[PDB]
Structure formats: C-alpha cells, structure tokens
Amino acid sequence: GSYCDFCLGGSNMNKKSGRPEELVSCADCGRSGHPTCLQFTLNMTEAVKTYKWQCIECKSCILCGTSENDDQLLFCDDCDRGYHMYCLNPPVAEPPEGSWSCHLCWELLKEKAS
C-alpha cells in the first residue's frame, strides 16, 4: 500500500487537501504521488499513472535508463522519460533541464493532431 510522498493519502484523496486525484507510484520503489503535488502536466499525469513512473530518483534516462550523467537527463514531465540532454534528437545543453517533453510524447504529439 503506497501513497503520495506529499500527502501520503491515496489518489482518490489528496489527504493534505482531502481532495480526489490520482497518485503515481515508482515501478521500482512504489512511492506514489499526486500529479498535483508533483506539479505534473495532464499528459504526464495520465502517462505516469499507467506506465512505470520511475520516481525521479530511479527516473534516469530512457535514452540510457542508467542515470549516467543525470546532469543532462531531461525529465519529460509529460510521462516521465528523462533524456540526458545530449541523448535527445535536438540535444540541449541546459535549456529545458526540468520540464520539456520527450520524443515518445512528441511522435505521439504529432500523432495527436489531425
């Protein structure tokens, strides 16, 4: 049994606010979290509740999934796919170190169109 590392309630409850939502546990730790307390975006929120929202610590790359440098890892808070900013297709050096979307989301982004 997990819960938001920020309220420790239970998704349908934001305990610290007693309001409903939907946590996100780490597919490694189990540490759940409300995307509201996580500052996530919808797409993230929706993507992280279904697949492995490896807690930001286990987050690592997706282009490596090793954490390697983790000083470049770009955390797509649109699902949680970190990419050492020099792993991306348009690799950055600093630019969107935190936010920024990933490629799976993008190809899926463009796919969302039409």
Binding site: D5, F6, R31, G33, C37, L38, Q39, F40, C55, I56, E57, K59, S60, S67, D70, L73, F75, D77, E97, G98, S99
Partner: peptide, 20 residues
C-alpha cells in the same frame, strides 16, 4: 518528485523541480 530523502539537496531556491 524532486527526489526523496537522501541528503539536503543542491538548490537553495524554488525554481524547477523533479530530477533526482
């Protein structure tokens, strides 16, 4: 988010979050 327990951190502000 913003990584759990494991130290004190590396930042002293409030900008950006979630990394490790």
């Amino acid at each position: 988010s913003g990584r759990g327990k494991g130290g004190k951190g590396l930042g002293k502000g409030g900008a950006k979050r979630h990394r490790k």
